[PDB]
Coordinates of C-alpha atoms in Angstrom, one line a residue:
Chain A
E597 CA -11.0 43.3 0.0
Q598 CA -8.9 40.1 -1.1
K599 CA -7.7 37.2 1.0
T600 CA -4.4 35.1 0.1
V601 CA -5.2 31.8 1.7
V602 CA -2.7 30.4 4.5
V603 CA -0.9 27.5 3.4
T604 CA 0.3 25.2 5.9
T605 CA 2.9 22.1 5.8
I606 CA 5.6 20.1 8.0
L607 CA 9.4 20.0 7.8
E608 CA 9.9 17.2 5.9
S609 CA 12.9 16.0 3.0
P610 CA 12.9 17.0 0.3
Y611 CA 9.2 18.0 0.9
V612 CA 10.1 21.2 2.5
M613 CA 13.8 22.4 3.4
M614 CA 15.1 26.1 3.7
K615 CA 16.2 27.7 0.8
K616 CA 19.8 28.4 0.4
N617 CA 19.8 32.1 2.2
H618 CA 16.4 31.7 4.1
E619 CA 17.7 34.5 6.9
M620 CA 17.9 37.0 4.2
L621 CA 14.0 36.5 2.6
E622 CA 10.2 37.1 3.1
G623 CA 7.8 35.8 1.1
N624 CA 7.5 32.2 -0.2
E625 CA 11.2 32.3 -1.4
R626 CA 12.5 31.0 2.1
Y627 CA 11.6 27.5 1.0
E628 CA 12.4 24.7 -1.5
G629 CA 11.1 21.5 -2.7
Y630 CA 8.4 19.5 -3.7
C631 CA 5.5 21.1 -1.8
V632 CA 6.3 24.8 -2.5
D633 CA 6.3 23.8 -6.1
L634 CA 3.1 21.8 -6.4
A635 CA 1.1 24.6 -4.4
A636 CA 2.1 26.8 -7.3
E637 CA 0.5 24.7 -9.8
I638 CA -2.8 24.0 -7.5
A639 CA -3.2 27.8 -7.2
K640 CA -2.4 28.8 -10.7
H641 CA -5.7 26.5 -11.4
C642 CA -7.5 27.3 -8.4
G643 CA -7.6 31.4 -8.5
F644 CA -5.3 33.0 -5.7
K645 CA -2.4 33.9 -4.4
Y646 CA -1.3 32.0 -0.7
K647 CA 1.2 32.6 2.1
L648 CA 3.4 29.7 3.7
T649 CA 3.3 28.7 7.2
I650 CA 5.0 26.1 9.5
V651 CA 2.8 24.2 11.5
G652 CA 3.6 25.0 15.4
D653 CA 4.3 21.5 16.8
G654 CA 6.3 19.9 13.9
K655 CA 3.8 16.3 13.6
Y656 CA 1.4 15.2 11.3
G657 CA -1.4 14.7 13.5
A658 CA -3.2 12.5 16.0
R659 CA -5.8 12.3 18.3
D660 CA -5.4 12.1 22.0
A661 CA -7.3 9.1 23.5
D662 CA -7.7 10.7 26.6
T663 CA -8.8 14.3 26.0
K664 CA -9.9 13.9 22.4
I665 CA -8.2 16.9 21.4
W666 CA -6.8 16.8 17.7
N667 CA -3.4 18.3 17.6
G668 CA -1.2 18.8 14.3
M669 CA -2.1 20.1 11.2
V670 CA -5.8 18.4 10.6
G671 CA -6.2 19.9 14.4
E672 CA -5.5 23.2 13.2
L673 CA -7.9 22.9 10.0
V674 CA -10.3 21.7 12.6
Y675 CA -10.1 24.9 14.6
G676 CA -9.7 27.2 11.9
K677 CA -5.9 28.4 12.0
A678 CA -4.5 27.3 8.8
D679 CA -6.8 27.5 5.4
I680 CA -5.1 24.6 3.5
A681 CA -2.8 21.7 4.0
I682 CA -0.2 20.5 1.2
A683 CA 1.9 17.4 2.9
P684 CA 2.7 14.3 3.0
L685 CA -0.2 13.6 5.4
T686 CA -1.1 9.4 4.8
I687 CA -4.9 8.8 3.8
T688 CA -6.4 6.8 6.5
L689 CA -9.9 5.9 8.0
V690 CA -9.9 8.0 11.1
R691 CA -9.0 10.9 9.3
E692 CA -11.8 11.0 6.9
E693 CA -13.9 11.8 10.0
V694 CA -13.2 15.5 9.9
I695 CA -11.6 16.4 6.5
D696 CA -12.6 15.6 2.8
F697 CA -9.5 14.5 0.9
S698 CA -9.0 14.4 -2.5
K699 CA -8.2 11.4 -5.0
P700 CA -4.3 10.6 -4.1
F701 CA -1.7 12.2 -5.6
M702 CA 1.0 9.6 -5.5
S703 CA 0.9 5.5 -4.3
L704 CA 3.3 4.1 -1.9
Chain X
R303 CA 0.3 -7.4 14.2
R304 CA -3.0 -7.3 12.4
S305 CA -2.5 -9.7 9.5
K306 CA -4.3 -12.6 8.2
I307 CA -1.4 -14.0 6.3
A308 CA 0.4 -17.0 7.1
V309 CA 3.9 -15.5 6.0
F310 CA 3.3 -12.3 7.5
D311 CA 2.8 -14.2 10.9
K312 CA 5.9 -16.1 10.3
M313 CA 8.1 -13.1 9.7
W314 CA 6.1 -11.7 13.1
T315 CA 6.5 -14.6 15.2
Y316 CA 10.8 -14.0 14.5
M317 CA 10.6 -10.1 15.1
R318 CA 8.5 -10.1 18.5
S319 CA 10.9 -13.0 19.6
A320 CA 14.3 -12.2 18.1
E321 CA 16.9 -10.6 20.3
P322 CA 19.3 -8.5 20.7
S323 CA 16.7 -5.7 20.6
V324 CA 15.5 -5.7 16.7
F325 CA 13.6 -2.6 16.5
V326 CA 14.5 0.9 16.3
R327 CA 12.9 4.6 17.4
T328 CA 13.7 6.7 14.6
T329 CA 14.6 6.4 10.8
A330 CA 18.4 7.5 11.5
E331 CA 18.7 4.9 14.1
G332 CA 17.8 2.2 11.6
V333 CA 20.0 3.7 8.8
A334 CA 22.9 3.7 11.3
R335 CA 22.1 -0.1 12.2
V336 CA 21.9 -1.1 8.3
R337 CA 25.3 0.0 7.4
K338 CA 26.8 -2.0 10.4
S339 CA 26.3 -5.9 9.8
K340 CA 26.6 -5.3 6.2
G341 CA 24.3 -7.7 4.1
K342 CA 23.2 -9.3 7.6
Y343 CA 20.1 -6.8 9.1
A344 CA 17.2 -5.7 6.6
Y345 CA 15.0 -2.9 7.5
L346 CA 11.5 -1.6 6.1
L347 CA 10.3 1.7 5.8
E348 CA 8.6 4.0 3.3
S349 CA 9.1 3.1 -0.4
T350 CA 9.5 6.8 -1.3
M351 CA 12.5 7.5 1.3
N352 CA 13.7 4.0 0.6
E353 CA 14.2 5.2 -3.1
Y354 CA 15.7 8.8 -1.8
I355 CA 18.4 7.2 0.1
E356 CA 19.6 5.4 -2.4
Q357 CA 20.2 8.9 -4.6
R358 CA 22.6 10.1 -2.1
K359 CA 26.4 9.5 -1.3
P360 CA 27.6 7.0 0.0
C361 CA 24.9 5.4 -2.3
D362 CA 25.4 1.8 -0.4
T363 CA 21.8 1.0 -0.4
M364 CA 19.2 0.2 -2.7
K365 CA 15.6 -1.3 -3.2
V366 CA 14.4 -4.7 -4.3
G367 CA 11.6 -6.5 -4.7
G368 CA 8.2 -4.9 -4.7
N369 CA 5.6 -3.3 -2.4
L370 CA 3.5 -5.2 -0.1
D371 CA 0.7 -2.9 0.2
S372 CA -0.7 0.2 -1.6
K373 CA -1.4 3.4 0.4
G374 CA -1.2 7.4 -0.7
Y375 CA -1.0 10.7 0.2
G376 CA -3.5 13.2 -0.6
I377 CA -4.3 17.1 -0.8
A378 CA -6.4 18.0 2.7
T379 CA -8.9 20.9 3.2
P380 CA -11.0 21.8 6.2
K381 CA -14.6 20.2 6.1
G382 CA -16.8 22.0 3.6
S383 CA -14.5 24.4 1.6
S384 CA -15.3 25.8 -1.2
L385 CA -12.0 24.5 -2.5
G386 CA -13.5 21.0 -2.4
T387 CA -14.3 21.1 -5.8
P388 CA -11.6 23.0 -7.9
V389 CA -8.6 21.6 -5.9
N390 CA -10.0 17.6 -6.3
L391 CA -10.5 18.5 -10.0
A392 CA -6.9 19.9 -10.4
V393 CA -5.3 17.3 -9.0
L394 CA -6.6 15.2 -11.6
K395 CA -5.5 17.2 -14.8
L396 CA -1.6 17.4 -12.9
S397 CA -1.5 13.6 -13.0
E398 CA -3.5 12.8 -16.4
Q399 CA -0.8 15.6 -18.3
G400 CA 1.9 14.0 -16.1
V401 CA 3.1 17.3 -14.5
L402 CA 3.7 15.1 -11.1
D403 CA 5.6 12.7 -13.1
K404 CA 7.7 15.5 -14.2
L405 CA 8.4 16.9 -11.1
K406 CA 9.1 13.3 -9.4
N407 CA 11.7 12.7 -12.0
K408 CA 13.0 16.2 -11.2
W409 CA 13.2 15.8 -7.3
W410 CA 14.5 12.1 -7.3
Chain J
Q117 CA -1.1 -17.8 -14.4
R118 CA -3.4 -19.1 -17.1
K119 CA -2.8 -22.3 -19.4
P120 CA 0.1 -22.9 -20.6
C121 CA 1.9 -20.3 -18.7
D122 CA 3.8 -19.4 -21.6
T123 CA 3.8 -15.6 -20.9
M124 CA 6.3 -13.9 -19.2
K125 CA 5.8 -10.4 -16.9
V126 CA 8.3 -7.7 -17.4
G127 CA 9.1 -5.7 -13.8
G128 CA 8.2 -2.0 -14.1
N129 CA 5.5 0.3 -14.7
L130 CA 4.8 3.9 -16.8
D131 CA 2.1 5.3 -14.7
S132 CA -0.8 5.2 -11.9
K133 CA -4.6 4.8 -11.8
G134 CA -7.2 2.9 -10.0
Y135 CA -10.7 1.8 -10.1
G136 CA -13.4 2.7 -7.5
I137 CA -16.8 2.6 -6.5
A138 CA -19.3 5.4 -8.2
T139 CA -23.1 6.7 -7.5
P140 CA -25.2 9.3 -8.8
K141 CA -24.5 12.5 -7.3
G142 CA -26.2 13.7 -4.4
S143 CA -27.7 10.2 -3.3
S144 CA -28.0 9.1 0.4
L145 CA -25.4 6.2 -0.3
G146 CA -22.6 8.5 -1.0
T147 CA -20.7 9.0 2.1
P148 CA -21.3 5.3 3.8
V149 CA -20.7 3.6 1.1
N150 CA -17.1 5.5 0.6
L151 CA -16.3 5.2 4.3
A152 CA -17.4 1.2 4.2
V153 CA -14.7 0.9 1.4
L154 CA -11.5 2.0 3.2
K155 CA -12.3 -0.6 6.0
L156 CA -11.8 -3.2 3.7
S157 CA -8.7 -2.0 2.8
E158 CA -7.7 -1.4 6.9
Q159 CA -8.7 -4.9 7.6
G160 CA -7.2 -6.8 4.9
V161 CA -9.8 -8.4 3.3
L162 CA -9.1 -7.3 -0.3
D163 CA -5.9 -9.0 -0.1
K164 CA -7.5 -12.3 1.0
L165 CA -9.7 -11.9 -1.9
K166 CA -7.1 -11.2 -4.5
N167 CA -5.5 -14.1 -3.6
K168 CA -9.0 -16.3 -4.1
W169 CA -8.8 -15.4 -7.6
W170 CA -5.2 -14.6 -9.3
Chain Q
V793 CA -25.0 -4.3 -18.2
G794 CA -27.2 -3.9 -21.0
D795 CA -24.7 -3.8 -24.0
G796 CA -21.2 -4.6 -22.9
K797 CA -19.5 -0.9 -22.6
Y798 CA -18.2 1.3 -20.1
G799 CA -19.8 4.2 -21.9
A800 CA -18.1 7.5 -23.2
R801 CA -19.1 10.8 -24.3
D802 CA -21.2 10.7 -27.8
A803 CA -19.8 12.7 -30.6
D804 CA -22.5 16.0 -30.4
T805 CA -25.3 14.2 -29.5
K806 CA -23.7 14.7 -26.2
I807 CA -25.5 11.2 -25.0
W808 CA -23.7 9.4 -22.5
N809 CA -24.2 5.9 -23.9
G810 CA -23.0 2.4 -22.3
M811 CA -22.7 1.8 -18.7
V812 CA -22.2 5.2 -17.5
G813 CA -25.8 5.8 -18.8
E814 CA -27.3 3.3 -16.4
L815 CA -26.2 5.8 -13.7
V816 CA -26.4 9.2 -15.7
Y817 CA -29.9 8.5 -16.7
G818 CA -30.5 7.1 -13.2
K819 CA -31.8 3.5 -14.6
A820 CA -29.7 2.1 -11.9
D821 CA -28.6 2.3 -8.3
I822 CA -24.9 1.8 -8.0
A823 CA -22.0 0.5 -10.0
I824 CA -19.4 -2.1 -9.1
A825 CA -16.8 -3.1 -11.7
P826 CA -13.2 -2.3 -13.2
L827 CA -13.7 1.0 -14.2
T828 CA -11.5 3.6 -15.0
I829 CA -11.7 7.2 -13.4
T830 CA -10.6 10.6 -15.4
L831 CA -12.1 14.0 -15.6
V832 CA -14.6 13.2 -18.4
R833 CA -16.4 11.0 -15.7
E834 CA -15.4 13.1 -12.3
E835 CA -17.7 15.9 -13.4
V836 CA -21.0 14.1 -13.6
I837 CA -20.2 10.9 -11.1
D838 CA -18.6 11.0 -7.8
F839 CA -16.3 8.0 -7.2
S840 CA -15.0 6.6 -3.6
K841 CA -11.0 6.4 -2.7
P842 CA -9.8 4.0 -5.3
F843 CA -9.8 0.3 -3.8
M844 CA -6.7 -1.0 -6.2
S845 CA -3.5 0.1 -7.8
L846 CA -2.8 -0.7 -11.5

């Protein structure tokens, strides 16, 4: 048996764009830009193949002040749908409560 | 709003009292303003997008000065993932050998 | 910023790196120190300290 | 610090000399200094998120 990890990300420019012919393709070739490039360099040093996915609500993510539900990619990790998140998610205090970010890849 | 700092408070005092409506709801509404009263309305946003927008037509926008603060993006994984070591190491390697710099040179 | 203020900076950068706190592996200090460090960047204290010497 | 150096992997003794040695050998409990972060340290000591750019 084998598993290919569920890579997840968000629609953002030029981080995630549709390929020139995204109607005519399946597999990772439907997409172009920074994150899909980087994911290859990660996996080629981390030992897996991977299937891309787009987050359902199109938002980075937050915690509801009312229900304390998490939504967005962090929430989808917390509820165990996606496997790994490769996106321009801003590192912040509250997010360290629930996921274990690496060192940053780019300052701003 | 949070700041200790005199200059930032001096700015916020105007920005919370200026009229007509000084804030904008979206990046598009901002860009659509900055092109109007040319030279007269300055606008603040993420330096990565600021650099990005200059590189496209009509090129009528450009960056100045420097950063007021430091923040950064990072890879994110579920809590306690087995990947939490290899990805975390790998991101260092991709920076120490300039691969990320090469990809940034490409995509900007 | 030292006397006689005769040097000049050139604007630009060539790379990116950063210092940080470190501990022995598996110390009980690990997570609570790291969580503490961000708050001082959140509440800006590090900027006021940076002014206080530079 | 005992002897004024951050420390590096020694040639074929494989000793950790210098300030890093104060944590690798457990001599001391925590470090707080300007201290460049790179792969050769991340194997043996952890780090927080970085508190400053350069």
